[model samples]
Target chain A: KSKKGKDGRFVNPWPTWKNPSIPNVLRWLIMEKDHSSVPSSKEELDKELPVLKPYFITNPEEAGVREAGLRVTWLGHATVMVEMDELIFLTDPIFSSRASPSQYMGPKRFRRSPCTISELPPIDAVLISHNHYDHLDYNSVIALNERFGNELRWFVPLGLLDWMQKCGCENVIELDWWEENCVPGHDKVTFVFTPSQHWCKRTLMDDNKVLWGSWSVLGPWNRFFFAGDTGYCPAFEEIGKRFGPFDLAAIPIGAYEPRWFMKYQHVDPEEAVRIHTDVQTKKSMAIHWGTFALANEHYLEPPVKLNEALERYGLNAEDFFVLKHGESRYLNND
Target chain B: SKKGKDGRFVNPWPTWKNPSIPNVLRWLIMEKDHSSVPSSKEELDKELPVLKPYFITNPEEAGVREAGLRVTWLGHATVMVEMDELIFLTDPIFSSRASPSQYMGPKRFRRSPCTISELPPIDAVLISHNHYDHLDYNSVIALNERFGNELRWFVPLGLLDWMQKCGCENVIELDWWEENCVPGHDKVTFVFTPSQHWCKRTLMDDNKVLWGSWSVLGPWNRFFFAGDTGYCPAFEEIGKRFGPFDLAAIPIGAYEPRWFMKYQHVDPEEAVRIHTDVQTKKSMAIHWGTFALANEHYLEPPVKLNEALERYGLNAEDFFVLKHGESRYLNN
Candidate 1:
């Protein structure tokens, strides 16, 4: 019914469709697992320090409209809290020790969260972009249900609503590409679902049976875009046309390994800066890195490449920037 | 459809749909020669842009398969625009007469040169306002029946309810300065723009329904459709925001008697001024030559427009006029 592309198919938002046969993926994992590049053993996954310090606050600080509306607190990985005048939203939050199904073996977290889920402010909503084990944690969903219940609104992609329902989330809504919810009367912001070039998979059987997309909290004061995961595509350019002059954005700046296989699903620091221009965000925080060692890049590589890419692109320090584990930023003078 | 402060619908962009009581009173004078004053039935006849078409050319509707861009002037305000992969009909009105009843109000100046059956399959219909002339009820139903409701209906902010009421289920309502990204295109962005126009369907519902322009922007091309508007500072602002448009369709009629219509419409020369203001690389004159809703004499717009272009030192190629059903294709 909706076709953003010439073909009625959903936009894959890929640099191009690259496929490695299962035999090749299997061969790489079994025969040619790069122990040097990837972790030599399970100890490799436990490399980054257990926890990093952050600007953990007990009481909210006083600020004017501009200051308060543009504040953001990065929790870790893809989890961040964006504060606006009327809406407070969380993005792809997973507080589990591992981003996996069983929590026994999978992409494990390198650092613990600066604060627990209970310490968070009253979150109005949560944006669940996909059904990946990392982005969608079953335990966290159940916990959040117990924590907030019907008081919280869950916005997920098309097919994740049923999964969320079983996880005890009572108030949930599914969004398709370009579908939006909430108006100014409800909140001073319009929560928009935009096209994100990525796929979703909880089990090997359901490869992209679910929808994946980006998000926008279009507020009167602070307009923001959060790309849960994406490769470089014209979707960001189109997004800029629709909601230009964004205040701040949370973009992935890592997980781009052997540019052939992962480039279609993830972006590097350089490409993330390109997104900064495409979506017209004033400042962007490097995310989807540092938490899980998802690829071959060094744990510290994203920010380093991010700095170089920012310089290469003639962008300012604020553009394509980052913060430590739980650091926050308020885009105001005072 | 959000009800804003004091229950007045609000768009992020500030739009002026309010008019003064005196101005509304003057509009009432024309709004109803049915005003219970001693008025004749003939005087009560609604206005038309023209009583007859200067030229009628039935355009070929089928299999222009490889055209990059093509535009057909259905008549007056209705224009069939086709970009590389998208086809949109603007403010369609194929009903023989534009009004509440067939016997009353403005009658057609020209039989639609191309009927619904004669037109190609449409992807969307851009509605300018709810004024009966631009949005005839029967035409919408027929368009829905013939084309099916799968075709998206692009209307202004407060007009979604009306479209839903009409059974055009696939309606996309946009607020002023907001955009809707049509799926299945190579990134076509339909941005609703502010216009110097007002809307009213019933006595108490004045300005309750919003009206605006549609700016179609793509990676390779940009098209502007000024649904219906007057000359205002907003034109210059629009140019700055979405300017250097590859093709534009601007209104060039109405605004004859400066008494009341001046504030609501641009005379041909003023339209020329708007033409320059909106930095349109190439343009065609619309909203004239079909329904004489204002005080201008039939066949008046093109003449004054030609003169205005001469004074402004613009070639006819810059902002040209088209006969009904005549289609022109653009390379980009």
Candidate 2:
């Protein structure tokens, strides 16, 4: 379906696409083995020791907001623990040494987890964006599901309900884009699936089989839009027009690199600023950087680039926020 | 802050008590779950296959210089060396895991830019006092295993024997203020300078050795690496003696909650001071954006560094901090 504006321009609800095959050369490069060997001896190890530091996790009470609203602690990458109205919500939570199904392979986190799931408060809601190993860790979700059981509500994108149900989570609710589902007593939380210029893949063979979208939580006093991993698109304007002036918009601001490959999937800091303006958020918080080295950009580039971008657009610090891992900020006051 | 002849104090090196061995034990046994380690095979199957490595050989004609030096980061602290007609490296870690064993430890967030086997032959390797993230066991052995007797390794005091144990021969260990000759490079010398840093490896050895910076002095080009140091008065002293280095590679990450880490790592602002204190002509900010080693926001270091540079009335382009996998060429 297409919506026509006053200018007589037809706006397509779902954007069209052209399928491009993954280059064989790129595939071979990804599969190549890292042949650098580990350093031996006390002297060798000492050379690299300056980078290690203990990961710190804050207590929920310490992270709580008594002003009757939500405060989010973005623990780097896709992991965020949010405290709202005395309940806690964690999104795409992975506290393991690696963000993979097994510990022996894949990309290992350079920095320790700010806090482990065991160190977390009893979670009330767990939101899953997709089944990417980094975003929706199976082991983490399973463990949390086993621990919290039916007491915890699982809010997931479409096609995730069965996965959660099969993994022992009983209260699983899956919402398609723009679909509204009641969250029991939370005044009918709507899971508006905003369009993202990104594709998905849990395994090699399952690319784009499921859908990914942003979530808009409509509360009485505050409204939230969680842009769960998307590139910049005009759909943001539609989202803003339909339900915006978002009190808080949690946006992805990392893992963007080699623009040719990642432009469609991840938004760089500049695009993030554009997304914030399009969504018309009062305040925006950046996530998806610092936790994992998923791209070629330096670990510090995202924030620096983000600040520069904000300055270029004449955006103030208050309008664009960057949260430390395990650090929380409130939404309602602003 | 106390001022001295050079407007900065060169205080006596403070005697830092070694970090406890038991702490490492506790970290391995209590904090990090090491009982049943996970395997790499299980994890690789789930990773996205889009990202890949780009390789460069020799010096790019664009970066090659007639007099100055060139550096290529081989991912996660391993840098390719081209200076003084001598090929040298610093803290050469080319391993998959920064651990005692390849089977486990902190894995690479992204693959190394190039493998050691794919690297050019090296004249010297600079060992920045032992840290797993910077130094790795298998990586050292593997380099030795590949380069054989042609490689001569330089390290801080008490690291020579450690290198020998790791199957590395032709090793030289220097104490602070000590200078050594690089074979075939008569105009250049490497001096081991003091830095406010500590060192340890296994559970048993804590600060049993030393850590310092390296001054690469060529006839016309000089480079300084503050090889993992905190903000200290020594920077001015070093500047006075070795004034106006051509390039300074400084660390600007892994610093947060100043009270705890101030003595160990320098944040971006402090990094600027170190740059000025070292009397560098051009500086490049490294170390912050690659790894998450502290609790600060992910992008805080670079943002603060940019502001700090501006506060000091320095242009952003004057001191370049390259993007990951980005390169710059310098010719003297």
Candidate 3:
């Protein structure tokens, strides 16, 4: 349902999501104080969620060059580099020091970015899930544009075309939920915007002005899914029925705590595992954690709880695995 | 007009307020003992007697298509409206239980007067919202199977995909104040009007879909279907746009514990208020006498409606409750 309010802003067709009020935020953060999830000091935070040196491929073009399969690399938090059919696709690429408008203030990143924009290989396209400051960084968009210019395509959900164009991205495609767009000059690859129970806001006034959703990038032989940022929604089952049995999927498993508020936008580790089964993904990698202290849970809690959920569901480690920063895996399903 | 944020739909008027979760729990659990309502099944049966519904065996033979305006109550918000050589069905829920599962939830005390097979050729179907009571899943599939693409379905926005998923292809979805003409029947038009109501079917899709009233404008006569709604200024706005309807099917039941249900369901007195607000020449009570969904006495709606009409100095016959399955013809 592509619904824009009379005010011409996008609306989430799902009812499970509610706007968090300022009073509610005050009650959750100030009235009912719980600082256990945050580190007692920077020393403990450094020890618990340390940023290790990532394994870098100097010649990044050599990655995921399989004739018939796919490759993936997690670049910290919600960003991932997906390579299929000799094309490199980036998802929510953020390499800034903070997930905020200004690096001097707001929630600063505890771990440094695994890789900078200049270090990466030539990209074919970028998929932006929404307009959140974390998922969509102004600096990252400008860097990508400066690197690839019009040769690189950017696929985004509806209401973000203007924003992408404003970022100097010349080749941009916007789509609504269930709407599909084919890669130019590459007929074999198609990008589909799928539904997710989420909202969008980058500034104080542009609340839900842009659409938020997941993405399904389908090739001739392989299909890759990116669960951008979402809570558990029935739309996943619908997505599975239409374009399911995905060879590889990047599922979010973090930023969910104080279930009262985050439950509608962020999926817990258990819910992420549930989505892995719901979307019928052959194999899944956990994303959207281990980079920032965005929620009340510890950084390591997502993977640890994800493993517990995998065991509880009788799934093997290979079914829905986790990756370190800049870790690459070649899925030779063929 | 009101727009919702955070991906949820909101009532256009600020007067509407959704009850809190704890208040809903209290109404369902702690405040269950109300003396105004029947306490047991035996008492309920005694208070609300089941009469053989007055069914018109054949509406075509009864001259419904040729009549200026005709309304047949099929029970509980389901009405077969015939006007301008077209037949329209409103919120056609004939299932025994108005629940996601047949094993539980609100069950109908009496069967509907007409089945899908018994009904005449339907030109279109109007759905108000995504409540189980208003839009039954099985019944929608059954109707689709029976009518196929011959009948068009008109629903509020955000329900088109669900309707198509139910095997209905020719579904027309609209927003409040949007109007669409009946396909192949240019003289008849359906205007999706605003209503003060919320919607939910599954546990998660609360207010995900839009809800509203329906206004049917024919070549000669105008009809309205107040599917299910609370009292609001939207009705007067509806009157200002397209009103003085020859006939209107308005809800007059399922309103109890006003503090909890006032934002969604209208009581009998509010029903009378809507009759005047919409400026209907004659209004029929349709949301009662078939299902006991609220805590009020099963037979209290019509009695209250009668009192309301008299107190408001209006003719009681103008605003009347039809027995389940009864048909009324209006002289336009």
Candidate 4:
């Protein structure tokens, strides 16, 4: 068990998922790739997916911390700033223009981050799901670590501490699936690392050498869950059973196309809705779409499909809905 | 890469899928009357074969020195194997009950023929997984107290940590397809091969450790231990890599309500397929006749195994089902 193999590489621990290979990807990119999701022109792209300025939380000390309320801002693809129970948490904070190791190559972001790192208020911690270029940007991590220094605790999966240390992030906590760690001094606030059906590889020879998973923050009054990136898996049911009725959950609802290839690692909008129900989150926000065109579903198709799924599942749109690139919302305890 | 992003072990084959919690509950609590129900110990005993516990007290004088191979069934996936003057034990469970607590869970209907004190000195102990029945705590402690660090412990990838925590220092762990030679015995290798099964000991840790079978290759003899697995293509691959084993210990029990246990536990029919797939000259039926882990009758496994051998047009003696504590000498 522990994903570390004889070669020191990590692996996905689910039979339902398979690690993506390079040759299969090359085949998909060369022969089966589709561009149907791309806008016809720049004008169309701007009109369809325009970036918006977020409601920046300028006054850090004045922002009241309601004991029974949870507030969060959607900063873009798999990145969100959450504030609850007097603790501020940011998830997968990616601000780089390209979701790639090299800025000039790989998938470029269609839209910019709603709020820059310089504009953000004090952050208690950051949660990283994996070392994917999109979720764990080198530049963004360096920037955040430089700003927060040792003040910001970076909670990551196993085998990521060295990467964090390389980025000058000395305040790092690594965890495995189903393992929990309390905020340095706040016993009431505990961060639990949960299972996800995904694989990791940043360099050519380092495939699955690091672990990836979702994060759940449990506090005195509110429980928050962040699905960094995942395909549909049964572990969510177990999570829901153990830590159910999350006050707020940020679930992904995009970059899922070519079901054959993506079905093992990425959940479509319908599956996103299923995850929302599975985790039993009181309110869920959709992320991982509209900012990056990583998959070949129409650029604006995710929210539409999510709405359709909500209707099919007899769920209210307000309970599980998408947010603007920079929009923020607060949920009160019921 | 057989590990998930969560750092838990995963079964890689397409034939593997865990039973749903709802379905498991349904089978454990309701709709579980498919197999025979023995009313009492007397009824169960009448249905089972009479056990004549006989051990080869001194292995150097026994068949192992001259005959090269000798296997003894200790009941329920536990076997004492002697090959070419070296002794190996597979998932030794000599405790009264195969549970975390002796007072609960499945109790042994009958004790193993030989105790830790009665067996010959073990050269190495091969563990398939950390299931309570296969890796009994008390039995391992007793073995360590008796053999100490003299006997080596070979386990799957994630079990070395637990073994070490239990004060077992001379232990080694290997992933699937990985092999290591016995210390000071370069001619003999212990290969950890893949098996279609999940692992769990306590409530929180499931698949936290790896589960696999063992392939022991001596200078002249090859041996395979099918450590509690369902039928999968891995067996064929294992046969291709280390085939024509002189003898094998295969499980033929704890398979009932096929839909629920199909992925983790194989039936007698599948056990026969494993015997053929592994290319074993002789296979002994274990994991039955001691405890009823599933809803299957205590005496159903060997009966079904014999029927299966007949259907496959294989000789019954090739895949023998010995009574508890009975020793069988095999030749290359």
Candidate 5:
């Protein structure tokens, strides 16, 4: 997902990685159907909200996690904390209520974050998927800087450090897709910035100026994959081929209401299931729903759809499941 | 005082610019007794402790600076200030000698208490000026290699371009009176304050870069670092904005032969005035032991400082003097 510099300008090389890929946003905004939810798609997947009875599930009691885990805390949306082998890793953290650049605009989050940024342990590293406001909020960046100091290393996509500088955060190394690198001072772990079919922009003029991708945290024992924000594409198969047999994968299964417009950008629940199979993970979890009202799905649409898709694929709930907003899967029943 | 085109800076007295012929005659006849320098090498060596060729162990491992506040005097103007979780170093010069070349020039009477490698992971490095003594090329380049260029650097405005030219990154260049928040640090912040000092390296360049002091204001305590400067009313101004500093490290040496050095370097007595002017609760003497940069005798700074504190009617403990490799974690 590299955007090589062409004539003093960095250009994205993918065929669909272009302004044309962003279907005339103004036209979409002008139309009513563009904002409407696909009720039929919702029913085809979920008849009722797949809400966790008591969402605050810190260290949930589960069996057979013996080797089935890292302490995976799905704080809702793409924000999660995976603690394994004493190394703390946060993925696409978004604690801010609003998913806009400004505080009072755009989509507001459905629930308060399960834990405060201060409440987190010393996070050694962070994994960012892309720069969409919902996935990459500004408030979280400032809070991370204030709380973590230089202890936390940011693993991001190409051309992102410049964007980070704009937010007053420093000490991040950008990784192009398929580019393999490792964190310094952190031993026995490998990070590979892999490919994903996604685009990025904070303003209209800058379309795909920076690259978008996923992260592969290949630890000593547990290998984790974060899908960040992306649609179903062949890149997932390629990622599976390269960094397969993931111990756990965080797959997005929400906000794909209108298949036409979002097909190029976001994946539906079924497609997310397809991604789970493509990535060849031993187990998977659902995210990217019940957090922000960015798209027209029900607040609990993602987990609901995720289960149905799992059933249709002949996979049981144990293979790929969903965690409560505040719940944690402490692997090995710890 | 500005230098450009060729990239350099230096400052000297009038008529001192013509060095080829004038320097020889002046060097031969200049009053050796104008300021009391050690008359002989044996006398100077006898007064100083035998410096070993090694660095001390990491103090952080012992939890010396885990909490509260402590300042470890490295040497010269170089000192390490550890307040809470953060560690800051001032004018770090770890090279064997402070001079134009390792082969020749002002050699240190004692080696630095610790090597750059022996230092605990530094959070920030403060550069007082572009002077060779204060800003050593090898030390900075070594620090960059050891810490990678991510260690936060606070320097004057003009020096940043030079630092970048020297392959240094992540420098927060500040102008006098301008303040900036330390990255990743919420309450701890720093402001560049004025210091009555002139900077120059060669005859072709002089004062092209600014020289000033720093005020690191934090929640628990505030620290004022007068890296290398003559005492002035500017300390009062600093006191008004970012004081009264909980602790201050002011210069108390390199002001002998006061005719030429008076406007640039603070004597011990002047350092006392600065401690009061900046409204510091506790003070320490620095810029004294490592190098005999000016005409000052090696050990006169502390003696004079003690006398000045008594004259000013302040306890010597309040205006305390620290030796190289000394540190203190001030109490509540």
Candidate 6:
């Protein structure tokens, strides 16, 4: 009923497989004969309501200055606010209280988001890779849609337009792998969807109903690749061969554990090095770690591992960059 | 560089610890050149797009259900799941985002639903470890005040008693491979399983505690909750010992640059591996859909998972990666 990929070979149209033996073991390990009754029967659900708080931004002029030029603020996770030429863009914008649907559940964040969505300058575009709640939050999409409406254009991966539209977003653009779209008049802002080895799902019923891909932002003199979620695959090389030599490449650096389960979806710091080289990027900015406690690694593991990885590859710190939350990076003219 | 008592560690906290705009400017000047400006108008324009608004909460949804198996996203690296007639919560955090309240540390772009007092009653709270994001003071106090007397807390070793000191009572701690009773449940057992990962709450307490997974089993259903972990071979051992989980909650986010994070967190593909490793009939992809903790685009994880599943010849149905406020039930 199940087949395996050829050993040491990268097969085309990658194979699908599942581990059959582990589920039973998991069941046996967690099973209890009697269910424990809770002490409280009232079900204190009242505590679940969220309070609305106001955040005052006193320095709109200063914020506006940063907002005018090309600015990239790495706010932990894959979420980054890129402001260029008076246009504000956000990638994987998760500005919720928690990453879960309920306040009483899931991996609580260690750090706070750099700025609230309301605190942010009006966003011009939202770059989404797939339909994961972390990346494509229903609440955030709806809020943005309500605030900006047709004025906001969303550049998302293939098959995500419908989801955006359902959320009341008016201007949504979807791209498949290797597809390219240009923003009218912005000659340097050509959005190209690249290939990544990954999948998509929102609920159990809808899986792979859409497609996932990385992105290449070709600026006038600088080229950047925003690699959506991916594992260590040969696609990196292909991407480099097709369109690389990028000035900056934003890559992930966290939440990879139990290699057997994570090897396909996440990459460790060492693998990030391999990707940096494969992509032929002049400089790499490390994101996705030290913000949320998504995995079992030490809180500071990503940067430590990054240092070791850089040393192993005989690369300097300049080649790889790590930005703090709310930090901005302005590219230099060569 | 000023050396501290640790000898090798740099001491930047006392003198230049404050991270204001000036500090940021200094850091930029030292690290990057300021002479470079936007090369072309289009390049600058590409950096910023027109404003696009979106919502982060599901206002239409209401009432946390036991049979409904609801999932509430709290933003990056946090979620609330209700399943099996029990109210289970993981990594409770309530703040602007994932930053310190101080101006020096990371600041949130948006405020959370406000305080922890707004959370529902929690039967059992699962703490992955002592990361600030996972074990926050404000969130802990709020939960303790709200449900400390009635709620049971589950955590890795060396964390329970300390957490109780923060006002959380009825705490149970377990080392790897250990199992404990969920108090009233005679049929359900909570087992602390192995995950390839480390732990450190603060600079002083590095690896002082243990880190692993939690396996919840009942007479008719089983669930595997991977609190936090990196890629390792222990998954096979776990599979051999405890397999065929009905539902598995696996993390699938914050994996950028495999070189560094591979040992700490699994990526989307690896999350699928955990699904297979734990041998679950149905798996929900957590961790990725909430926060932007890594370098990939925000929506990249779900997309990557799709490709990974397809490459492995698996249907998306087998692995349930839920939306922020979606819910599903299994009557097995």
| Top of the candidates by lDDT | 4
Please provide, for model 3 over A1-334, each residue's C-alpha lDDT reduced to its tens digit, 9 standing for 90 to 100: 3331112132542222324211123222222224435554334555665444434445644655565778888888889988887688899988765566642234546565766665677788999888887788776787688667898999998788998888788899998767888768777888998878777777665666688888998888789999999878777877777885899989999888777877777889899999999999999999998876667787678899999999989998899998876677888776
**Model 6 C-alpha lDDT per residue in residues B1-332, reported as the tens digit of each score:** 22111111241211111211112121112333212222232332343222211122433243433343455555444556555556677777655434333212222222343335335556777777666556766667767767766777888877876787787778888876677766665456777776655555445565567667777765556777786666666566667677777777787776765655676778878888888877888787766533344455555678888888887779899886754434565654
lDDT of 2 by residue, B54-86 (tens): 334443343333676777655545665577677
| Local distance difference test scores for all models | 0.70, 0.66, 0.76, 0.77, 0.71, 0.62
Error in Å for residue B181 of model 1: 73
**What TM-scores do the predictions have?**
0.45, 0.47, 0.46, 0.47, 0.45, 0.46
DockQ of each: 0.00, 0.02, 0.00, 0.00, 0.01, 0.02
lDDT of 3 at B27: 28
Cα RMSDs, all models: 27.8, 19.2, 25.2, 25.4, 18.1, 26.6
lDDT by residue for model 6 (A54-172), tens = 22234434433233234567865888766554455778877664565444444444455666554566676778876665666665776577557787888987667887787788788
On residues A1-334, what C-alpha lDDT tens digit does candidate 2 reach at each position? 3441111111422221312223222421223223222233323333432222112232334554564666777765778776665556777787654566443356655544565454467687777766666787665776587557788888887667777887788888887655666555565454455555655566565555566666776655567777878777666787788885787888888877766777766789999999999989888989887666666676667888899889989988789988765566766644
* Fraction of native Cα contacts reproduced by each candidate: 0.00, 0.00, 0.00, 0.00, 0.00, 0.00
Q: List runs of model 3 lying over 4 Å from the truth.
A: A1-35, A39-56, B1-332
* Predicted structure 5: lDDT: 0.71
Question: Model 2 compared with the native: what TM-score?
Answer: 0.47
**How well is each residue in A213-299 modelled by candidate 1, as lDDT tens digits?**
789888766788999887777678777888868888899987777667766677888999999988988888887887777777776
Give the chain A TM-score for each candidate: 0.85, 0.82, 0.88, 0.90, 0.83, 0.79
Distance (Å) between predicted and true CA of A230, model 3? 0.7
The TM-score of candidate 6 is 0.46
Judge candidate 2 at residue A178 and give its lDDT. 59
Question: 1 or 6: which has the higher lDDT?
Answer: 1
lDDT string for model 4 (B1-332, tens) is 43211223254222233432222232235543536554443464466644544543454444475447888888888888888657889999976566664223665666567666557778889999888889987678768867778889988877888888777988988877788876666677888887877677777566668788899988878899988888777687778777889988889988886877777788999999999999998899878888767888777888899999999999798898888777887777
> Where does candidate 5 stray beyond 4 Å?
A1-69, A332-334, B1-332
**Per-model TM-score of chain B:** 0.83, 0.81, 0.87, 0.88, 0.84, 0.75
After aligning candidate 1 to the native by TM-score, how far in Å is the CA of B305 from where it should be? 99
